[PDB]
Amino acid sequence: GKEKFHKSQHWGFCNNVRMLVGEDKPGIGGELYSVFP
Amino acid sequence: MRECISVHVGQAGVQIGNACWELYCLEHGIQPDGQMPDSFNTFFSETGAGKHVPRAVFVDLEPTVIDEVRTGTYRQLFHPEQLITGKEDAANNYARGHYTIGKELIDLVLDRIRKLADQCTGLQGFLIFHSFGGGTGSGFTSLLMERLSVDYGKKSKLEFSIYPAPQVSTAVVEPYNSILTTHTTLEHSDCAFMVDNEAIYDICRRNLDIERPTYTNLNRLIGQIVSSITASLRFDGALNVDLTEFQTNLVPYPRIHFPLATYAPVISAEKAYHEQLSVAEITNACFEPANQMVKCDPRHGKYMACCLLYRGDVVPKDVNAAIATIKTKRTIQFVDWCPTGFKVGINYQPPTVVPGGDLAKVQRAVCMLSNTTAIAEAWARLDHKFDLMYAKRAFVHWYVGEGMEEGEFSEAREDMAALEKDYEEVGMDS
Amino acid sequence: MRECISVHVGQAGVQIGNACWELYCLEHGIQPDGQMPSGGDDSFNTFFSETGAGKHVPRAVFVDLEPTVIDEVRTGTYRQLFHPEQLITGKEDAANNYARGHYTIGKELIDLVLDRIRKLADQCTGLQGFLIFHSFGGGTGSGFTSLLMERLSVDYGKKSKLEFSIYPAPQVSTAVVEPYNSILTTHTTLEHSDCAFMVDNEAIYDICRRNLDIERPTYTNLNRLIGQIVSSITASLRFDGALNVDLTEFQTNLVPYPRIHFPLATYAPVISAEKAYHEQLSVAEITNACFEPANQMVKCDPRHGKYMACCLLYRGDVVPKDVNAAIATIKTKRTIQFVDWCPTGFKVGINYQPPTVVPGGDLAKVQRAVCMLSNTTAIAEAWARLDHKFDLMYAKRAFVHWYVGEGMEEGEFSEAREDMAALEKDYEEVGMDSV
Amino acid sequence: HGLPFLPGTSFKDLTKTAFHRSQTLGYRNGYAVVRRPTVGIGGD
Amino acid sequence: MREIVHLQAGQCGNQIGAKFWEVISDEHGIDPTGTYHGDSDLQLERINVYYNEATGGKYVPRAVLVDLEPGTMDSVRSGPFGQIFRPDNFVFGQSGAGNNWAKGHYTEGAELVDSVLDVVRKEAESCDCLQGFQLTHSLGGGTGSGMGTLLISKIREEYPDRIMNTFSVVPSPKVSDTVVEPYNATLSVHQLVENTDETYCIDNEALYDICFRTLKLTTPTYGDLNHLVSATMSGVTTCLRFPGQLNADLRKLAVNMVPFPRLHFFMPGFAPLTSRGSQQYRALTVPELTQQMFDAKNMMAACDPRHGRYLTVAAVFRGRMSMKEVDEQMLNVQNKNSSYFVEWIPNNVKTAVCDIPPRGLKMSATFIGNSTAIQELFKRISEQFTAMFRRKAFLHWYTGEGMDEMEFTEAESNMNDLVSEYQQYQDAT
Amino acid sequence: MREIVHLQAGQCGNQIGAKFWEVISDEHGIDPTGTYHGDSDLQLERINVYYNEATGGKYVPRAVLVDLEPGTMDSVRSGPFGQIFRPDNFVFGQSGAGNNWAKGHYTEGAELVDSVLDVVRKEAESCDCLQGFQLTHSLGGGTGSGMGTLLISKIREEYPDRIMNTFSVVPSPKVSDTVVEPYNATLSVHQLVENTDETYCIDNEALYDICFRTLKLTTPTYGDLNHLVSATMSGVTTCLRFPGQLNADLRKLAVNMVPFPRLHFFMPGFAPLTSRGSQQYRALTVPELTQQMFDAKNMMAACDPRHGRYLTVAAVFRGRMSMKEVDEQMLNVQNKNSSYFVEWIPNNVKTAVCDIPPRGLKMSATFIGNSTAIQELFKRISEQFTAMFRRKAFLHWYTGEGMDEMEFTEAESNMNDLVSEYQQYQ
Amino acid sequence: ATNYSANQYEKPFSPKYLQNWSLAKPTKERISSHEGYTQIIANDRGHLLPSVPRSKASPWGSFMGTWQMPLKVPPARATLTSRTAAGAASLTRWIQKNPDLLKASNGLRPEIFGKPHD
Ligand SMILES: Nc1nc2c(ncn2[C@@H]2O[C@H](COP(=O)(O)OP(=O)(O)OP(=O)(O)O)[C@@H](O)[C@H]2O)c(=O)[nH]1
Ligand SMILES: Nc1nc2c(ncn2[C@@H]2O[C@H](COP(=O)(O)OP(=O)(O)OP(=O)(O)O)[C@@H](O)[C@H]2O)c(=O)[nH]1
Ligand SMILES: Nc1nc2c(ncn2[C@@H]2O[C@H](COP(=O)(O)OP(=O)(O)O)[C@@H](O)[C@H]2O)c(=O)[nH]1
Ligand SMILES: Nc1nc2c(ncn2[C@@H]2O[C@H](COP(=O)(O)OP(=O)(O)O)[C@@H](O)[C@H]2O)c(=O)[nH]1
Ligand SMILES: [Mg+2]
Ligand SMILES: [Mg+2]
């Protein structure tokens, strides 16, 4: 964006094997269960 | 991924880390209860209740300054396990923080690091905050790196230290603590970014028109540095830099690992209107000896390793033209054995201003980290003060009685003399 | 580009700098809050700068050792224009001592002023040179302006360094120990200065009394007339003109010899509003007023000496033919004597833009204007009278314990007069015709 | 007024007062930049 | 049927490679998802050279991304064209490089060799007839200079008859972007000179002046610099993808570019690179393209070709053009400038003319110059490496993990032998 | 075909050449945006000599713009025809020349001479057959006099077989516009003697006398003084551009005007120039134009040809006129006063004509004359120079840039030899 | 460190073009070629080996501050023409009597371009 450049950590490790850890994560701030009040 | 464990020891580390973790929660959206109203996973650990817990440990041998954290705004944020309190303070003694009272508390700290080392997929390095002058700031800090080195070894280990002020001093037994903590941590630390107290007093007097600063202004200014050092592990940048990068580009020798910290856009809300803050005009202010935050002019020394960390609306060409202008200046002199001198770090994220602070919302910022020869006179003056005290045996019964041989004072002084011989033998040419 | 950096040192430099920088704002439309009520015009960058938000900050530095001359600027109508760090004050003044301005109190702020000039020079894409405003008589107006130039010669070298100096007037004077400062600040500036435009208060007093219809003029009237000169000097590179004149060309066309660099500045279309209604101001008619001895802004008769070089700067709707026909009549005139080794004598410069009045000032709306900067042999008798002032105080060693007692050897006085006593024969040698 | 371009056919406007020279040729961070001229002499 | 495998080592090669695949997908018509939305049918027959067909009509690039951390590949996929690479092609380690050629080549890069080469083989064994390999990295960092150079070594010991092409970013001459960069440059050159057939010397300073003097870009970024690199990499492979009246793939280009196996260091350039507001001041003809290729200040290597002699020059022209104009212009430059062209190779220019231009342009050409003035690059790093090896400057970060000083010693000899060979075939008659 | 590269340096050169590019665009129909908006096809056929084709029928000139300070270029670029020049052809410095030949030629001119000759090499081999060069400047300046002579030497060492021109503005006789004019003039002429094939000497005083006494002009600016210079430039280049009955290019003039390789300083003039209200009193015939050709007040050098003798004379005409009338008039002016012409050449005058006059005139001509009486221009500078040189008037601004004293003595000797060889044929 | 030249692109990074108008340190134009391995001149921890020759200068630097700077500072403009021989001697003597200033990093680079009368 303009004021928001948060780089999400898309990749990672679980069970000691290479992977995409997220599979639903934001990008540079924007996009690439029940709802309670 | 890219996790980083931060360690604070001493009352200096706690009060600096209070303003540090105020900034880290504010630039990631973390509300001061842990809840968020994946960049956080380098400093914060997300719990299965939605409460993001800091990846840090608050070790201090004195309970008084810790109970401010347990009572104030960040009570629910910090983990009661992950915060370790002492019983009695080290009382400005290296001996008490290293041998008598530090030994009964260090056995619980490394267990805390070990549970914190299991939740990190890849650990970039450690991050230790202390001050030279204190007892648990110098004694207990030494017990860390002796035990962290045997536990981890090749893991990166960066550290932040409050250097003793060159003209004022909070205590008298301070040169005893500073010489004794550098003798044992000279070979147990990868790099030691250094910062002073009287220099920031000058920075907070000239650059911003807030006369009479307190410690909160100093921790806020230090907190901007530590965020700028680790900004590239969390936000996208033009050319990214790691935490592991800082040890092999700023430390030429295993004895010379004391670089200097410098923040250039140190400006108030009333003066950002008066001047533009372009990359060329702020990088020239990094090398300006009035903007440096350790009281030693680098014009009287030599540069052997420099690091630049830009964050904001910066242009790589304007970065290139700025450094080439500094390379043409006769004020800046380098050594014969370092023809490169510089590395760059650029982040797209502009710095996040804290409300209630003093620095204005700047479009771009730069943090300057350089190892210089001018710190040799700072070591020379500090050893003078040690030599005036150790000549006729003074305050030594407060060290030798508390489980510590008096001959340590010797081999610390023998070491430190060679460290000055290490600084003039690196400046001479062929 | 074409940037210029102005240094105002002493009380005189600030008070002239107040009238200089108000006029530069009216020439560009920059309001006192530093906002232009408008990429359009970029003619301001020779004096002003930009911050992105439409703010123009002067490329000037204000240094003084007495705070209560700059503190008006910090709390005046231009308190938002100047950068606070560009206004520099000390704790104690130089107390009318060159020794305090050079050796003890002037050495205080010199590292901070050099630092500020570097930050100003780092913003300059093309730097024409340095302008320095002071008075020979002041403590810091003679001491600090001497220490600055030695440091500028070390740091900036052969960069053009021009001065606007308030000469001690030959009969009217303010201070008593003033002739001591004038000799000392002349001695250490000869090898460091490039050119020194000179003017004193008494000759402006007569011009303000006679040419303008103002009785009892103030220092504010003097500073505007000086400000009109510096504006007329620089506006060739500020504005479109037929003959462009730069700051570097002044040292070439007015300094023939390395140790004589003291021309005299005058501004001849200075007439009142009641008196401008009757006379016409043609190019030939206003350029003869540049050569009248009563209209000279330095109290010395040019008929007593010989002209070495002249620099005519025309400002307004001047026609180059009428400029040319006017100089030809002056050459045919016999009462003005030029030296044999300078058959040319004249450098002319023409700028299209008319002088804009300060609203409510003394100067009338002239359609065209001329500013003359001439190096004359007639300044030698000014040194001869200034020798009569310093020496008549030095034979009894009067007022030296204030100088020798603070950072300064007595042998300085025993070398700084002999060197400028050589100017007396330097001005004699250039005033003899070769047979 | 439609006259051919001859040396005697040059006439200036006397109502124009502002003569401001804009800097469309300058230097950025090492290069001689030549800007697109947006205004002429005097700000018009 | 004549496909090539793309390699991306280091964060410098990742942003260059991501911009490269964006340029190719724009040129071949591939959308950010992977399907085809191209207008002309000449964008389909030779997709195979770069992409692979996946079930669903989606084309997958034949590229592998290697780094010692996923830090820069977080930004690669967060970009516009990060959804086209397979997740299996992303290979990342655990801890960073530290600008250390040690960690990229001995300690940390060694655990990732078996994972990346397994990816390299499974692309190459799905190939009907593999043409070569193509790598982007930098000689200043740790992963690009250490891991990528090791990847060249392990690929070449398995596929010797195939060609190894790389586009290395050399360290800057004036302002260093890494304090410890002369070590990582010298250690990479010592193995680049032995295990590669084509290498391209790309320097950041030359891209900056190209962006200011010729492009007149007021505020350039790394997106523009990687685009100029990507236009060069697409130019050299155009005859693989598009038909032409005079075609030359990489091997036909490599055979007559290098006269000796150790002399394979080149200088890239782009011909029709013009500004925004001066498009109407310059005609777009054959004499204008050949001048801009042979103008000195259009190099991408920051080494002046007028300080040496051009051994061999390449000219991969793209666009419908008359061959007499191409041939007569190449003859003039060789004739007008005879002191900057060697006299023991009679012709020094290879000409290949394709038919399909880059989109948005009428005519284009790519310059590849094997000047003897690229020894200035090797002379400069050798002095720096001398200055840091004489007084042991940063050796303990390198010798403290397993390398011996003899490795740094033999890197000096071989690289200084390279300057000796360049000087020998510059003064020869 | 027969292209000319135009180069210009200095403030005086830039203002003259900007007006020169206005007269060329007016007669070739080039619009301020740089498009052909003319009437006839004999306006487009020989565009190549000055302009260059661009994309979409645009004509960019072949001018190279040199100065050490673009304050003059900023004035030119803000004019009505300032956008036709390519921005890449603008080469400029950062500091001023200072009216110093030493700065323009030795120290400050050295950092820009690499960039100028790159632009000159850009515009040299981009044309099929370069006819030659042309330089406009003033000898009294610092960068026109200093760098312009440096750019002349660098062109001559690479392109020595092509004619090069010099429209230098020589110092005025009675009033100087710069104090250090004799130093810059002596040092520039010494370069111009052995480095130029033709040189046209122009001063402001004769242009002032033409504007006052012959144009009846009340307010002459520099726009209409440079127009007189610009009309002469178009006159000599006319046969290069438009068809005529007797064509004569630059070198064909130079072959039979330069009798010895040293004598190439000419005198320009413009015959059809008339007064303010005197057009109705004027007959439109060749004899009245011919008597304004050789008339002394029409000269552009303020050196009276009655005091000397004509070595060679050139006469380029414009318009549809018969040539018996032109040839008879040139024979009568040689025969009526033969004391003003050298007796050792039977015909001192070359006749050249063209069929296309400039717009608004039915018949035009230009005068280019090599006379002996130009030696008093050099003596006047020399007597002014040696007056400043015996007392060492302004040498410390010249020797402070590394320049030695023997060059000044050398520059005096070359002018004094040029005076003596002019004096030989009189 | 040595300011290297990019050969063809040294011109845009010349000192005054980078807006540094202060006598800036020069750039190197040519570099030679070595012919093999270098020699370790200094052991670990940075000490120079005993055998090798050592330079004779301040290890720290040559910065001359505003208080250690000599009084009566010489000029940078030191032309000697139109000057008498005694005066030209005094100008030469003044510049040559302070060798500390002429060897400093923030020193005075003089230019004595001129010959006095005889
Ligand atoms: N900048 C900054 N420095 C601090 C702050 N708090 C303490 N210090 C530094 O630390 C000194 C106080 O003593 P410390 O060194 O912290 O004492 P300690 O480390 O807790 O050791 P002991 O109390 O003796 O057991 C002060 O003089 C400061 O220099 C702070 O909030 N900001
Ligand atoms: N023309 C003119 N001259 C002035 C003006 N103000 C002061 N002067 C002259 O300056 C001389 C005194 O020097 P100042 O600049 O005022 O004082 P200073 O430089 O601060 O010296 P110290 O206070 O002793 O350190 C007087 O003799 C005046 O002639 C002014 O406004 N106009
Ligand atoms: N062209 C280009 N060069 C880059 C980019 N990012 C980094 N570099 C270059 O890479 C060099 C440093 O290499 P480094 O980033 O440490 O490589 P790594 O350690 O393998 O990740 C610098 O000199 C940069 O010039 C980019 O996005 N584009
Ligand atoms: N004819 C003519 N002469 C000019 C013009 N502008 C300046 N001059 C002459 O040029 C001389 C000044 O030289 P100048 O161009 O300022 O030197 P420079 O600054 O080094 O280029 C003066 O004698 C003027 O008479 C002009 O537009 N036309
Ligand atoms: Mg405590
Ligand atoms: Mg005062």
Angle between helices F181-193 and F375-390 (to 10 degrees): 130
Task: Kindly state the helix (H) or strand (E) to which residue E231 belongs, with its residue range.
Answer: helix E222-236
Residues within 5 A (CB) of ion ligand 6: C 11, 66
Amino acid in the structure at residue C329: T
Angle at F287 between CA F282 and CA F290, to 5 degrees: 100
Residue F37: closest CA among F27, F45, F46: F27
Q: Which ligand is nearest to the CA of B225?
A: 1
Does any CB of chain F come closer than 8 Å to the CB of residue E284?
A: yes
Give me the phi and psi of G75, to 5 degrees please. Answer: -85, 165
In a mutational test of the D interface, the residue from C38, C236, C353, C357 whose CB has the highest number of chain D CBs within 10 Å is C353
Nearest to B250 by CA among B316, B191, B162, B333: B191
Tokens 């302006």 — which residue?
C145
Check CB contact under 8 Å for E283 and F53: yes
Q: Is the beta carbon of F93 within 6 A of some atom in ligand 4?
A: no
Query: Does the beta carbon of E16 lie inside 6 Å of ligand 3?
Result: yes
Asked if C264 and C376 touch (Cβ cutoff 8 Å), the reply is: yes
Contact of E93 with E67, CB cutoff 8 Å = yes
For residue C63, what is the enclosing H or E element? strand C60-64
CB neighbours of residue B389 within 10 Å: 18
- B245, B377, B408, B420: the catalytic one is B245
CA-CA distance, B375 to B178, in Å (whole number)?
14
Which residues have CB under 8 Å from E372's CB, separation 6+?
Answer: E308, E309, E310, E311, E342, E422, E423, E425, E426
Q: Is residue F144 in contact with ligand 4, taking CB distance under 6 Å?
A: yes
Do the domains E375-425 and E265-374 match in fold? Answer: no
Q: Which CATH class is domain F375-425?
A: mainly alpha
Please name the residues in contact with F264: beta carbons below 8 A apart, sequence gap of 6 or more: F196, F197, F198, F199, F254, F257, F258, F370
Neighbours of E346 (CB within 10 A): 8
- Which of B276, B297, B328 is most worth mutating to test chain C (most C CB atoms within 10 A of its CB)? B276
Instruction: Find tokens 């540090």 and name the residue.
Output: B20
- Two tokens at B186? 């000279």
Question: For residues C115 and F401, what is the distance between their CA atoms, to the nearest angstrom?
Answer: 29
The response to whether residue F143 sits with its C-beta less than 6 Å from ligand 4 reads yes
Nearest CA to ligand 1 atom 3: B12
Token output for G64: 């001359």
- Going by C-alpha positions, the residue among B230, E389, E283 that lies closest to residue F48 is E283
Cα separation, F135 vs C91, in Å, equals 60
Measured between alpha carbons, how far is B277 from B274 in angstroms, rounded to an integer?
Answer: 10
Q: Which of B282, B315, B317, B319 to mutate to test the interface with D (most CBs of D within 10 A)?
A: B317
In angstroms, the separation between the Cα of residue C319 and the nearest Cα of chain D is 12
Cα E46 from chain centroid? Answer: 21
| CA–CA dist E249, E364 (Å, integer) | 17
CB E134 within 8 A of CB E166: yes
* DSSP result, E342-401: -SSSS--EEEEE-S-PPTT-S-EEEEEEEETTTHHHHHHHHHHHHHHHHBT-STHHHHTT
Sole residue written with tokens 């202008």: B325
**How many C-beta atoms lie closer than 10 Å to residue E46's C-beta?**
19
Tell whether the torsion through CA atoms of B85, B88, B93 and B96 is positive or negative: negative
Residue B8 CA to residue B83 CA, distance in Å, equals: 10
Domain E265-374 class, CATH top level: alpha beta
Quick check: D19 and C125 CB within 8 A? Answer: no
D28 in F contact zone (CB under 8 Å): no
Whole-angstrom Cα Rg for chain G: 20
Query: Of B30, B269, F19, which is closest to residue D10 (Cα–Cα)?
Result: F19
CA dist., res. E307 & res. C372, Å (int): 53
What residues in D contact C351, CB-CB < 8 Å?
Answer: 19
Shortest-distance ligand to the CA of residue B92: 1
The side-by-side arrangement of strands in the sheet containing E3-9 is E90-92, E63-67, E3-9, E130-138, E163-169, E198-202, E265-266
Nearest Cβ partner for B328 among G24, G46, G48: G24
* Residue E12 CB–ligand 3 contact under 6 Å: yes
Neighbours of chain C (3+ CB pairs under 8 A): B, D, F, G
Tokens read off for C318 = 């001047």
Task: Please check whether residue C194 is in contact with residue C156, taking contact to mean a CB–CB distance below 8 angstroms.
Answer: no
Q: Residue B60 has which token pair? A: 């201090």
Inspect the structure and tell me whether chains E and C have 3 or more CB pairs less than 8 Å apart: no
b/e sequence C190-224, b meaning 16+ C-beta within 10 Å: bbbbbbbbbbbbbbbbebbeebbeeeebeeebbbb
Q: Give the Cα separation of C281 and G112 in Å (integer).
A: 48
Q: Cα–Cα distance between F139 and F192 in angstroms, integer? A: 10
**Diameter of chain B measured on Cα atoms:** 64
Adjacency order of strands within the sheet including F3-9: F90-92, F63-67, F3-9, F130-138, F166-169
Whether the CB-CB separation of B395 and B389 falls below 8 Å is answered with yes
Is residue B114 packed enough to be buried (19+ CB in 10 Å), middle (13-18) or exposed (0-12)? exposed
Cβ–Cβ contact D30 with G under 8 A: yes
> Which partners does chain F have (≥3 C-beta pairs < 8 Å)?
C, D, E, G
Q: Is C227 annotated as a binding residue?
A: no
Residue nearest ligand 2's atom 32 by CA: C219
Name beta bridge partners: E200: E167, E266
Tokens 């290890």 appear where? G59
CB–CB contact G4 E299 (8 Å): no
Q: Fill in the DSSP letter of residue B111.
A: H
Sheet of E349-353: strands edge to edge? E268-270, E364-371, E310-318, E349-353
**Rounded CA gap, C123 and B42, in Å?**
40
Within 8 A by CB and 6+ apart from F221, the residues are: C242, C319, C320, D10, D12
B131 labeled binding residue:
yes
Distance (Å, whole) CA C155 – CA C115: 11
d(CA C108, CA B167): 20
Residues in A touching E91 (Cβ below 8 Å): 18
Quickly count: other Cβ atoms within 10 Å of residue E105's Cβ: 27
B62 is in an annotated binding site: yes
Q: Residue B92 is encoded by which pair of tokens? A: 């400005």
The total of other beta-carbon atoms located within 10 Å of residue E262's CB is: 14
Find the farthest-apart pair of alpha carbons in chain A and give their distance in angstroms, rounded.
Answer: 39
Active-site residue, B146 included: no
The helix or strand, by DSSP H or E, that contains position F8, with its residue range, turns out to be strand F3-9
The residues near C396 (Cβ < 8 Å, ≥ 6 apart) are none
B219 is in an annotated binding site: yes
Residues whose beta carbon lies within 6 Å of some atom of ligand 1:
B 10-12, 15-16, 61-62, 89-92, 131, 133-137, 162, 170, 197, 215, 218-219
Token readout for G75 is: 């000029």
Q: What residue type is assigned to position E7 of the chain?
A: L
Which token pair is C243? 């003959």
> What stretches of B47-124 adopt beta strand conformation (E)?
52-54, 56-60, 83-85
User: CB-hemisphere CA count at 13 Å for B272?
Assistant: 14
Give the helix, strand, coil percentages of chain G, each rounded to 5.
20, 5, 80
Q: Report the alpha-carbon distance of residue B84 to residue B22 in Å, rounded.
A: 19
| Helix/strand/coil for B193 | strand
Quote the tokens at residue E120.
């390299």
The class level of CATH for F3-257 reads alpha beta
Q: Is the CB of F72 under 6 A from ligand 4?
A: no
Q: How far is residue E114's CA from residue B186's CA, in Å, rounded to a whole number?
A: 38
Cα angle, residue E277 at apex, residues E272 and E279 outer, rounded to 5°: 35
Catalogue the active-site residues of C: 249
Nearby residues of E161 by Cβ (< 8 Å), 6 or more positions away: none
- Cα C399 to Cα C402: distance, rounded to the nearest angstrom: 6
**What are B129's strand-pairing partners?**
B8, B160
Q: Which of B42, B25, B21 is nearest to B34 (CA)?
A: B25
- Pull the structure tokens for residue C386: 């200034």
3-state helix, strand, coil in chain F (%, to 5): 40, 15, 40
CA–CA dist F376, F372 (Å, integer):
9
Does D28 lie at the interface with E, CB-CB under 8 angstroms?
Answer: yes
Q: Do D30 and B318 touch (CB under 8 A)?
A: no
Looking at residue E89, the DSSP 8-state letter turns out to be: G
Per-residue CA distances from B160 to B179, B204, E27 (Å): 16, 20, 51
Question: What Å distances lie between residue C31 and C48, C239, G103, CA to CA?
Answer: 12, 19, 48
The pair of three-digit structure tokens given for residue G85, joined into one six-digit string: 């021989």
Looking at the DSSP bridge assignments, the partners of residue G77 are: G111
The set of residues, in sequence order, having a beta carbon less than 8 Å from that of F183 and lying 6+ positions away, is F101, F385, F388, F394, F398, F408
- Give the C-alpha distances (Å, rounded to integers) separating C84 from B265, C80, F260: 17, 9, 70
Q: Which of E99, E172, E222 sits opposite B248 (nearest CB)?
A: E99
Coil, strand or helix: which one is F286? helix
User: What is the CB neighbour count within 10 angstroms for residue C375?
Assistant: 27
Please report, for residues A11, B28, C114, C407, the alpha-carbon distance to residue B38 in angstroms, rounded to integers and kept in the order given: 10, 10, 49, 66
Cross-chain Cβ contact C155/G87 below 8 Å? no
For C152-166, b/e burial (b = at least 16 CB within 10 A) is bbbbbbebbbbbbbb
Cβ atoms of C166 and C141 within 8 Å: the answer is yes
Residues β-bridged to residue C7 = C61, C132
Domain boundaries, chain E: 3-257, 265-374, 375-425
User: If you ran DSSP here, which 8-state letter would residue B287 be given?
Assistant: S
Residue F294 is encoded by which pair of tokens?
Answer: 């050789």
How far lies B417's CA from each of B176, B183, B372, B374, E85, in Å? 15, 10, 18, 16, 57
E287/E285 Cα distance (integer angstroms): 6
| β-strand partners of C314 | C350, C370
User: What is the C-alpha separation between F219 and B135, in angstroms, rounded?
Assistant: 89
Sign of the four-CA dihedral E243, E248, E251, E253: negative
Q: Name the closest-CA residue to atom 18, ligand 4.
A: F141
Contact status, residue F13 vs residue F229, Cβ threshold 8 Å: no
What residues pair up with E368 in beta bridges, in sequence order? E268, E314
Whether the CB-CB separation of C2 and F69 falls below 8 Å is answered with yes
- What residue type is assigned to position F116 of the chain? V
Q: How many CB atoms lie within 10 A of CB A11?
A: 24
Torsion sign across C-alpha atoms E293, E298, E303, E305:
positive
The closest of E77, E144, E78, E68 to E110, measured between CA atoms, is E68
Radius of gyration over every alpha carbon of chain E, rounded to an integer in angstroms: 21
Check whether B276 is labelled as a binding-site residue.
no
How distant is the Cα of B349 from the closest Cα of chain A, in angstroms?
5
Q: How far is the CA of F77 from the centre of ligand 4 (A)?
A: 18
Q: How far apart are CA G11 and CA F418, in angstroms?
A: 40
**What is the greatest pairwise CA distance in chain C?**
66
Name the token pair of C429: 């040698």
Is E141 annotated among the ligand-binding residues?
A: no
What whole-number distance in Å separates Cα of residue E14 and Cα of residue E91?
12
* CA atoms of F368 and F371, how far apart (whole Å): 10
Which residues are paired to E3 by β-bridges? E130
B386 contacts: CB under 8 Å, gap ≥ 6: B175, B176, B178, B179, B413, B416
Q: At what angle do helices E375-390 and E405-427 cross, to 10 degrees?
A: 150
Q: Does B154 touch chain D (CB under 8 A)?
A: no
Contact B79, B49 (CB under 8 A): no
Contacts of B293 (CB under 8 A, 6+ apart): B195, B196, B199, B200, B203, B221, B260, B261, B262, B263
Give the Cα separation of G90 and C257 in Å (integer): 17
Owner of token pair 């200093």: F146
In F83-159, where do the E strands start and end? Answer: 90-92, 130-138
